[PDB]
Protein backbone atom coordinates (compact mmCIF):
# COMPACT_ATOMS: atom_id res chain seq x y z
CA UNK A 1 0.00 0.00 0.00
CA UNK A 2 0.98 3.56 -0.69
CA UNK A 3 -0.40 7.06 -0.03
CA UNK A 4 1.91 8.64 -2.65
CA UNK A 5 -0.37 11.32 -4.14
CA UNK A 6 -1.33 12.60 -0.72
CA UNK A 7 2.28 12.49 0.50
CA UNK A 8 3.40 14.51 -2.51
CA UNK A 9 0.51 16.99 -2.08
CA UNK A 10 1.56 17.45 1.55
CA UNK A 11 5.18 18.06 0.67
CA UNK A 12 4.05 20.56 -2.02
CA UNK A 13 1.90 22.40 0.53
CA UNK A 14 4.77 22.51 3.04
CA UNK A 15 7.11 23.89 0.39
CA UNK A 16 4.53 26.45 -0.71
CA UNK A 17 4.03 27.60 2.89
CA UNK A 18 7.78 28.04 3.39
CA UNK A 19 7.97 30.07 0.17
CA UNK A 20 4.92 32.18 1.10
CA UNK A 21 6.24 32.82 4.65
CA UNK A 22 9.51 34.04 3.24
CA UNK A 23 7.76 36.21 0.65
CA UNK A 24 5.56 37.72 3.36
CA UNK A 25 8.53 38.67 5.49
CA UNK A 26 10.38 40.05 2.45
CA UNK A 27 7.35 42.07 1.42
CA UNK A 28 6.82 43.52 4.91
CA UNK A 29 10.49 44.51 5.05
CA UNK A 30 10.23 46.14 1.64
CA UNK A 31 7.16 48.06 2.75
CA UNK A 32 9.09 49.43 5.75
CA UNK A 33 11.99 50.46 3.53
CA UNK A 34 9.73 52.04 0.94
CA UNK A 35 7.95 54.15 3.59
CA UNK A 36 11.28 55.16 5.10
CA UNK A 37 12.50 56.27 1.62
CA UNK A 38 9.21 58.17 1.04
CA UNK A 39 9.70 59.94 4.37
CA UNK A 40 13.34 60.78 3.53
CA UNK A 41 12.28 62.25 0.20
CA UNK A 42 9.50 64.25 1.80
CA UNK A 43 11.91 65.57 4.43
CA UNK A 44 14.33 66.70 1.72
CA UNK A 45 11.52 68.64 0.04
CA UNK A 46 10.37 69.97 3.43
CA UNK A 47 13.79 71.43 4.13
CA UNK A 48 13.74 73.09 0.70
CA UNK A 49 10.25 74.48 1.38
CA UNK A 50 11.32 75.84 4.75
CA UNK A 51 14.44 77.47 3.24
CA UNK A 52 12.41 79.23 0.56
CA UNK B 1 -7.99 10.35 3.20
CA UNK B 2 -6.80 12.27 6.23
CA UNK B 3 -3.37 13.16 4.75
CA UNK B 4 -4.96 14.50 1.55
CA UNK B 5 -7.46 16.55 3.54
CA UNK B 6 -4.67 18.07 5.63
CA UNK B 7 -2.61 18.81 2.49
CA UNK B 8 -5.61 20.66 1.13
CA UNK B 9 -5.98 22.72 4.30
CA UNK B 10 -2.24 23.51 4.31
CA UNK B 11 -2.41 24.54 0.63
CA UNK B 12 -5.19 27.04 1.51
CA UNK B 13 -2.99 28.36 4.33
CA UNK B 14 -0.18 28.87 1.78
CA UNK B 15 -2.55 30.69 -0.57
CA UNK B 16 -3.70 33.05 2.15
CA UNK B 17 -0.08 33.90 3.02
CA UNK B 18 1.02 34.25 -0.62
CA UNK B 19 -1.95 36.54 -1.36
CA UNK B 20 -1.04 38.76 1.57
CA UNK B 21 2.60 38.81 0.49
CA UNK B 22 1.58 39.84 -3.05
CA UNK B 23 -0.59 42.63 -1.74
CA UNK B 24 2.19 43.95 0.49
CA UNK B 25 4.83 43.67 -2.25
CA UNK B 26 2.57 45.63 -4.68
CA UNK B 27 2.12 48.39 -2.09
CA UNK B 28 5.86 48.43 -1.39
CA UNK B 29 6.57 48.82 -5.11
CA UNK B 30 4.11 51.68 -5.41
CA UNK B 31 5.52 53.48 -2.40
CA UNK B 32 9.13 52.98 -3.53
CA UNK B 33 8.28 54.44 -6.92
CA UNK B 34 6.64 57.42 -5.20
CA UNK B 35 9.81 57.87 -3.11
CA UNK B 36 11.98 57.83 -6.26
CA UNK B 37 9.79 60.47 -7.90
CA UNK B 38 9.80 62.71 -4.80
CA UNK B 39 13.56 62.37 -4.33
CA UNK B 40 14.05 63.31 -7.98
CA UNK B 41 11.87 66.38 -7.32
CA UNK B 42 14.15 67.47 -4.46
CA UNK B 43 17.23 67.09 -6.65
CA UNK B 44 15.57 69.00 -9.53
CA UNK B 45 14.75 71.89 -7.15
CA UNK B 46 18.40 71.83 -6.19
CA UNK B 47 19.68 71.73 -9.75
CA UNK B 48 17.54 74.66 -10.80
CA UNK B 49 17.87 76.78 -7.64
CA UNK B 50 19.06 80.35 -7.79
CA UNK C 1 -7.32 10.99 -5.65
CA UNK C 2 -9.29 14.13 -6.47
CA UNK C 3 -8.51 15.78 -3.11
CA UNK C 4 -4.75 15.22 -3.24
CA UNK C 5 -4.70 16.45 -6.85
CA UNK C 6 -6.62 19.64 -5.81
CA UNK C 7 -4.29 20.23 -2.87
CA UNK C 8 -1.26 19.83 -5.14
CA UNK C 9 -2.65 22.29 -7.68
CA UNK C 10 -3.58 24.79 -4.94
CA UNK C 11 -0.04 24.47 -3.43
CA UNK C 12 1.51 25.09 -6.88
CA UNK C 13 -0.56 28.27 -7.24
CA UNK C 14 0.59 29.51 -3.83
CA UNK C 15 4.17 28.66 -4.55
CA UNK C 16 4.11 30.63 -7.86
CA UNK C 17 2.39 33.63 -6.28
CA UNK C 18 4.96 33.62 -3.46
CA UNK C 19 7.82 33.59 -5.95
CA UNK C 20 6.37 36.58 -7.77
CA UNK C 21 5.76 38.41 -4.48
CA UNK C 22 9.40 37.86 -3.47
CA UNK C 23 10.58 39.21 -6.82
CA UNK C 24 8.30 42.24 -6.43
CA UNK C 25 9.55 42.80 -2.88
CA UNK C 26 13.12 42.84 -4.10
CA UNK C 27 12.19 45.26 -6.87
CA UNK C 28 10.64 47.58 -4.25
CA UNK C 29 13.68 47.21 -1.95
CA UNK C 30 15.94 48.22 -4.84
CA UNK C 31 13.82 51.23 -5.71
CA UNK C 32 13.62 52.28 -2.06
CA UNK C 33 17.42 52.16 -1.76
CA UNK C 34 17.71 54.33 -4.86
CA UNK C 35 15.23 56.83 -3.48
CA UNK C 36 16.97 56.85 -0.07
CA UNK C 37 20.34 57.60 -1.72
CA UNK C 38 18.85 60.30 -3.96
CA UNK C 39 17.16 62.02 -0.98
CA UNK C 40 20.59 62.14 0.69
CA UNK C 41 22.06 63.69 -2.49
CA UNK C 42 19.40 66.35 -2.41
CA UNK C 43 20.08 67.34 1.16
CA UNK C 44 23.82 67.39 0.50
CA UNK C 45 23.48 69.70 -2.46
CA UNK C 46 21.17 72.00 -0.49
CA UNK C 47 23.58 72.26 2.43
CA UNK C 48 26.54 72.90 0.09
CA UNK C 49 24.61 75.78 -1.56
CA UNK C 50 23.26 77.34 1.65
DSSP string spanning C16-47? HHHHHHHHHHHHHHHHHHHHHHHHHHHHHHHH
Do residues C25 and A26 lie in contact, with contact meaning Cβ atoms separated by under 8 Å?
A: yes
Query: What residues have CB less than 8 Å from A46, skipping those under 6 apart?
Result: none
**How is residue B48 annotated by DSSP?**
T
Pick one of 1.10.10.410, 3.90.1150.10, 1.20.5.190, 3.30.70.100 as the CATH number of C1-50. 1.20.5.190
Pick from C24, C32, C46: which is nearest to B26 by CB?
Answer: C24
Q: In A, which residues are within 8 Å of B6 by CB distance?
A: 10
Any chains having at least 3 CB pairs less than 8 A from chain B are A, C
CA B34 to chain C, closest CA, distance in angstroms equals 9
- CB within 8 Å: A41 and B45: no
Instruction: State whether CATH 1.20.5.190 applies to domain A1-52.
Output: yes
Burial B3-27 (b: 16+ CB within 10 A, else e): bbeebbebbebbbebbbbbbebbbb
Resolution (Å) of this entry: 1.3
* CA R_g for chain B: 22
Amino acid sequence: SSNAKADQASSDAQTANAKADQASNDANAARSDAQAAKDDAARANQRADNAA
